[PDB]
Design a protein around this nucleic acid. Structure first.
Ligand code: MG
Ligand code: MG
Ligand code: MG
Ligand code: MG
Ligand code: MG
Ligand code: MG
Ligand code: MG
Ligand code: MG
Ligand code: MG
Ligand code: MG
Ligand code: MG
Ligand code: MG
Ligand code: MG
Ligand code: MG
Ligand code: MG
Ligand code: MG
Ligand code: MG
Ligand code: MG
Ligand code: MG
Ligand code: MG
Lengths: 60, 70, 145, 80, 63, 143, 55, 206, 67, 141
RNA sequence: UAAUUGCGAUAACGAACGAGACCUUAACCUACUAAAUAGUGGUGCUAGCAUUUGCUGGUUAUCCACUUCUUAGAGGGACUAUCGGUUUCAAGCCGAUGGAAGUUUGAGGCAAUAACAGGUCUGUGAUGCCCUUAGACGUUCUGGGCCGCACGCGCGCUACACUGACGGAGCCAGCGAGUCUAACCUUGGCCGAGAGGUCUUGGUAAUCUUGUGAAACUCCGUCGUGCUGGGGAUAGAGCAUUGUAAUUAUUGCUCUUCAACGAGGAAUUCCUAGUAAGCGCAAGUCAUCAGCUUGCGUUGAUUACGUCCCUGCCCUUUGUACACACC
């Protein structure tokens, strides 16, 4: 959870009110053993605005 | 500076003959007998235990506590 | 540790290094009433002089005291380091001293003078009876003088 | 070629805050009465079938002293 | 020195402008069948036991 | 029965080992000990003077025995505590890595600890050995 | 220069200390105007036409 | 008591006194009775306990305060004055010591002696600032049991805390001495003096 | 304070009005009835509601209730 | 495998897991006997279940406790809990009900929340004070 | 009632905004879907002690099984439930039981209409008008200044010690954050009294720093009421780090120097449970600098559970020649 904690006032007067924004980062991973074909079939599609898909290979 | 810090010969004899009758004996008790500062009082507690008189019925730092032998 | 006895051996108050030291205070801290011997310094001098730090100032054989002073005013020979010392790197002969007793009063004045005499700000600032380490002087320190 | 733009109309602007704000701006700037400009906006948003809508104009018209107005119609909730 | 013990029955309420004081009716056990209203300082509930230092001078309102 | 060292109260153990290392003679004690301080966050040196190097070594050993591996950087943190910054609030401060590193080097020459892969210092088989022994010694004083 | 700065008597803590403290030091906020917040000073005025014509 | 051994073993005084009677650090909760009517129901004792430490939800209701064991109340109250806020381990040990000390003097269950000083220092009646017109006199009141217990604890500990401040006697002895002197009010104890002086004034405005 | 809002109390009325046969002195089943028979947008509000239609049910059995 | 259950205990942010297998009566915590636990003044707080229910009763089992998180008191309240729960967990699956219940009767009738974890938790600080309720000082003039 | 929250009375009836609902976070799931970036039991390989099986460790994969603990999806859970007392037996309040949980479950987010000449043109390439515009009020470069010290006022930090200081030893969190066209978080190894230095290393991170082995705290010792070894201001002399730059001492370390302060007048602040108080840590700022803040967990109380005396506000009644509304 990404927190930013600012004063509300753009200046300085007033009882010092504080406010905290937060951006929630959700991260998942799924492990698959598959041939070459399905991988691209599975990566090109299921694509979504908002979700960041990243595919790594290899055992290290 | 105001007394109780050394071992004035008569003092040791005071420490042997004047310590029955103490239902309670500890560091504070030893200082209260117009004698011995806490330090040599603490050395006394150990060396009054060299043999008897005091029964060790409590542990440690800050607090000691002792009772007359039987 | 032990119960001791002693005759008339130990004397209360003893005067070494032109200053008075009370007996019946543990010899390490007893030593500190000398100008230029803080707790650390005394502790090491005593450890270096082959003395028992269970002993008061009062006890101590003349010889033992003899040693202590000797080491105190030559800390370099008797393998006390130098980073242990209040005047490393003089500024004239640039040797490494450890200035003690009546002498530290002098040497403070010596330095305070060298600054004033060379007209450097810290000196001027000293001459004025002000704070010299750069602290804000608006709100703090108003009794003094 | 590794970046690509595509324009696209919006399914009825009437339910878009941002669209209707920029409309007002254009109403006043093109020189319309204030209540006229505000009311037509409210009565088109409503017309585009909203549950409710409110328009504030704060600032100064002609007089030196500044004022505000609320132009509202139909239903709104304000919390949670 | 006479001790006089009374058992609290019914909490009456708060007096004293501040309100720390609570009115209450009691019944002494050493010869019952006789009620008195007292003023208390501490927190009180029913069946608590009060030591009346003197046994006959009940009070009322407190400013 | 058969014993470990975990079967022994920390202070009862460490003093028992302490005594032993002194009672022994095999060591390597820096020599700056008696003038050094243990941490920049301290005020006075140890009051054990002759000794206490045996104490930390004992402590240091027992610690490493109780874990996989540990280095100078961690011991410096273990042994350090609060430091009065005079009139400014307290702050934790690490202890000195000279004392520690030298303690690890000593214990190893004496063969109670060895270097470890991955990193740091690992308990040694010959440490396991002798620690489990004196622990057993310490439990048999209460028999 | 600096030579002057030390040579200059009438300086340093000693001197100030022996000088009485002014009373502007122990004063107030002064405030000056705030009970006139609502009473407009412009002397001008809008008018019921120009306001109607705009709002 | 018939002993019992398993792998990692439990010591003799441990096995013995425990399973048998459910007694304190090692003092008896049985016997130990509240010599003043009332104060019972407000001086706990039974359920018995090993030490005076307890993650107890004793605040969230008005009178549940009273169900806490009166020893652990006493120790709870030692741990204050800024520097000592929290520090219950500190406190707990002081009591364990205090009790041992008290035990040495005059025998008696030390926890019982605590009971006596507690009862014996609670103002049977007091006073409060009533209006009546600016010139505010003092109306006499009869103080509740709870206020009588509470106040006793505060008064007892406080007197000792002040005795303990700035002298060689340890905080455990000053507590002990206050307690003992208050076990039957010798009027040489800070608590009784203040109790009795409270009831003096309470009487003279009636 | 645990005084129920109007939405709840109003929903209890309306329910008891048209489903008195079915419903019960028991909340747990009264709970479940609500899911079937009525639409609510939160678990909380549904409980809220049913616990009160339960309460109302519970003292109807011992004489009428106004409204 | 032998008969075995795992339990845990919590207090503040401490969490103390226990394993109560069948064995010859050991009672270790983190890898040392329960007799070595420390803060020492509170040792009888974690002995507490054992004596509450009869120092035997453990002769057919082994206990290992592993406390991570929390602090130097909360860990003691967490380990005692997991012990007592472990004893009731086991009987529930391997002994019989009555045995289990009698055991719960002893703990509850005494209790420092032995079977049941304290819901108490730290309330968040809010701006304007160094505390959660505590407020920064003010002056007016 | 926390609530124009409801009950009830009732020329009103039935509703909408705001309150509530809702949302977020902290609490309960041996029920569900899983996990070599979390972890457990078993087994191989292996060390130490005991040996009679035992006890305590090692081994980012030598295999097997599980999901209790950790993680986060989906659900479930509580609705002041059951019972009781009280009340116009109305809404409700109170107690006992059970329960993870029964003070709006705890804490927040959101939050109507209206008022103010509240603050902000010094956040804005938001902005009207006035001013200025080449000897500039544009801009940049060098240097000083915002820190300047008879003094008044506020927030704070550290203290006056023995429920303590010091020295050894025990030894436990939670919220975070970290390096690409770069030099961020730093383990480990050596060197160094320390601060630091140096050689390497892991991590764009549940993977490495880090179990952030934090501090109060606990234990065994020294000291022994003495301005004492409480306290650490002020000042001297040296060593290092950041930076182009440290003088008016950035900060860090070492020796020395060793002030006031012995619980604080009139006054005044904050606070009701994991709260107050004590105690540290991460984050913002940040080249370097926290005695500040925002959050975090650790230790953990005393005392109410009331009232209208003080102070502040809200409501009704009432007067008004005010309505730019007692400025
Ligand atoms: Mg000196
Ligand atoms: Mg400065
Ligand atoms: Mg709403
Ligand atoms: Mg809301
Ligand atoms: Mg330490
Ligand atoms: Mg530490
Ligand atoms: Mg402190
Ligand atoms: Mg699970
Ligand atoms: Mg209950
Ligand atoms: Mg203005
Ligand atoms: Mg602006
Ligand atoms: Mg400024
Ligand atoms: Mg402020
Ligand atoms: Mg310490
Ligand atoms: Mg060097
Ligand atoms: Mg790399
Ligand atoms: Mg001094
Ligand atoms: Mg100091
Ligand atoms: Mg920072
Ligand atoms: Mg600031």
């Amino acid at each position: 959870v990404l927190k930013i904690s600012t004063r509300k006032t753009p200046n300085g007067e007033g009882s010092k009110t504080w406010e905290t924004y937060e951006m929630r980062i959700h991260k998942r991973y799924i492990d698959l053993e598959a041939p070459v074909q399905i991988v691209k079939r599975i990566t090109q599609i299921t694509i979504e605005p908002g979700v960041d898909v990243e595919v790594v290979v290899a055992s290290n | 500076a105001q007394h109780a810090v050394i071992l004035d010969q008569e003092k040791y004899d005071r420490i042997l003959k004047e310590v029955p009758t103490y239902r309670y004996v500890s560091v504070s008790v030893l200082v209260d007998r117009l004698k011995i500062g806490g330090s040599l009082a603490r050395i006394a507690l150990r060396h009054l235990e060299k043999e008897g008189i005091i029964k060790p019925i409590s542990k440690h730092s800050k607090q000691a506590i002792y009772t007359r032998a039987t | 540790s032990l119960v001791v006895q002693e005759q008339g051996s130990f004397q209360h108050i003893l005067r070494l290094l032109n200053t008075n030291v009370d007996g019946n205070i543990k010899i390490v801290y007893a030593l500190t009433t000398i100008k230029g011997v803080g707790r650390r310094y005394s502790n090491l001098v005593c450890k270096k002089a082959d003395v028992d730090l269970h002993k008061r100032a009062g006890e101590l054989t003349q010889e033992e005291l003899e040693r202590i002073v000797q080491i105190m005013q030559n800390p370099t020979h008797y393998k006390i380091p130098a980073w242990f010392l209040n005047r490393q790197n003089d500024i004239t002969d640039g040797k490494d001293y450890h200035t003690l007793a009546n002498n530290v009063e002098s040497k403070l004045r010596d330095d305070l003078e060298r600054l004033k005499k060379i007209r450097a700000h810290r000196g001027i600032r000293h001459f004025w009876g002000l704070r010299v380490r750069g602290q804000h002087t608006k709100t703090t320190g108003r009794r003094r003088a | 070629g590794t970046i690509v733009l595509y324009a696209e109309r919006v399914q009825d602007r009437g339910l878009s805050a941002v669209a209707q704000a920029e409309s007002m701006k254009f109403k006043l700037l093109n020189g319309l009465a204030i209540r006229r400009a505000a009311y037509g906006v409210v009565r088109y948003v409503m017309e585009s079938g909203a549950k409710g809508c409110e328009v504030v104009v704060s600032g100064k018209l002609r007089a030196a002293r500044a004022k505000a107005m609320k132009f509202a119609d139909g239903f709104l909730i304000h919390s949670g | 020195t006479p001790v006089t013990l009374a058992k609290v029955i019914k909490v009456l309420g708060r007096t004293g402008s501040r309100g720390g004081v609570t009115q209450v009716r009691v019944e002494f056990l050493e010869d019952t069948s006789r009620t008195i209203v007292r003023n208390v300082k501490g927190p009180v509930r029913e069946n608590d036991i009060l030591v009346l230092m003197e046994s006959e001078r009940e009070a009322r309102r407190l400013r | 029965p058969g014993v470990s060292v975990r079967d022994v109260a920390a202070q009862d153990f460490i003093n028992a080992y302490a005594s032993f290392l002194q009672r022994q003679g095999k060591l390597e004690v820096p020599g700056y000990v008696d003038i050094v301080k243990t941490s920049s966050g301290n005020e006075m040196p140890p009051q054990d003077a002759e000794g206490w190097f045996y104490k930390r070594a004992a402590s240091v050993a027992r610690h490493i025995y109780m874990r996989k591996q540990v280095g100078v950087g961690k011991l410096n943190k273990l042994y350090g505590g609060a430091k009065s910054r005079g009139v400014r609030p307290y702050k934790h401060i690490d202890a000195s890595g000279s004392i520690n590193r030298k303690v690890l080097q000593a214990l190893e020459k004496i063969g109670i600890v060895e270097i470890s892969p991955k990193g740091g210092r690992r308990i040694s088989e010959n440490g396991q050995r002798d620690l489990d022994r004196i622990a057993a010694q310490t439990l048999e004083e209460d028999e | 220069g600096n030579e002057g700065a030390i040579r200059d008597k009438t300086a340093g803590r000693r001197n100030n200390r022996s000088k009485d403290v002014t009373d502007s030091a122990t004063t107030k906020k002064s405030n000056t105007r705030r009970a006139t917040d609502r009473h407009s000073r412009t002397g001008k005025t809008d008018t019921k036409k120009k306001v109607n014509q705009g709002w | 008591f018939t002993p019992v051994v398993l792998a990692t073993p439990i010591p003799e005084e441990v096995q013995q006194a425990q399973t048998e009677i459910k007694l304190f650090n090692k003092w008896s909760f049985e016997e130990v009775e509240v010599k003043d009517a009332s104060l019972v129901d407000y001086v706990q004792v039974r359920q018995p306990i090993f030490v005076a430490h307890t993650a107890g939800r004793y605040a969230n209701k008005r009178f549940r305060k009273a169900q806490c064991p009166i020893i652990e109340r006493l120790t709870n109250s030692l741990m204050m004055n800024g520097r000592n806020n929290g520090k219950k381990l500190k406190a707990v040990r002081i009591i364990k010591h205090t009790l041992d000390i008290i035990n040495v003097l005059t025998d008696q269950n030390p926890i019982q002696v605590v009971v006596d000083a507690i009862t014996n220092t609670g103002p049977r009646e007091d006073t409060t600032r009533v209006g009546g017109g600016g010139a505010a006199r003092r109306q006499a009141v009869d103080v509740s049991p709870l206020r009588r217990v509470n106040q006793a604890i505060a008064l007892l500990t406080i007197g000792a805390r002040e005795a303990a401040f700035r002298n060689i006697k340890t905080i455990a002895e000053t507590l002990a001495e206050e307690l003992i002197n208050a076990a039957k009010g010798s009027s040489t104890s800070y608590a009784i003096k203040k109790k009795d002086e409270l009831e003096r004034v309470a009487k003279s405005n009636r | 304070g645990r005084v129920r809002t109007k939405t709840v109390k109003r929903a209890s009325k309306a329910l008891i009005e048209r489903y008195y046969p079915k419903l019960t002195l028991d909340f747990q089943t009264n709970k479940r009835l609500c899911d079937e028979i009525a639409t609510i947008q939160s678990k909380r509000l549904r409980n809220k509601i049913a616990g009160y239609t339960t309460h109302l049910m519970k003292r109807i059995q011992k004489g009428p209730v106004r409204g | 495998a032998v008969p075995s259950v795992q339990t845990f205990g919590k207090k503040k942010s401490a969490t103390a897991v226990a394993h109560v297998k069948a064995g010859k009566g050991l009672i270790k915590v983190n890898g040392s006997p329960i007799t070595l636990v420390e803060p020492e003044i509170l040792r009888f707080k974690v002995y507490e279940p054992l004596l509450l229910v009869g120092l035997d009763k453990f002769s057919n089992i082994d206990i290992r406790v592993r406390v991570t998180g929390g602090g130097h008191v909360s860990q003691v309240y967490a380990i005692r809990q997991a012990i007592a729960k472990g004893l009731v967990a086991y009987h529930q699956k391997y002994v019989d009900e009555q045995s289990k219940n009698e055991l719960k009767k002893a703990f509850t009738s005494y209790d420092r929340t032995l079977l049941i974890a304290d819901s108490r938790r730290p309330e968040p600080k809010k701006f304007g004070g160094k505390g959660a309720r505590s407020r920064f000082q003010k002056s007016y003039r």
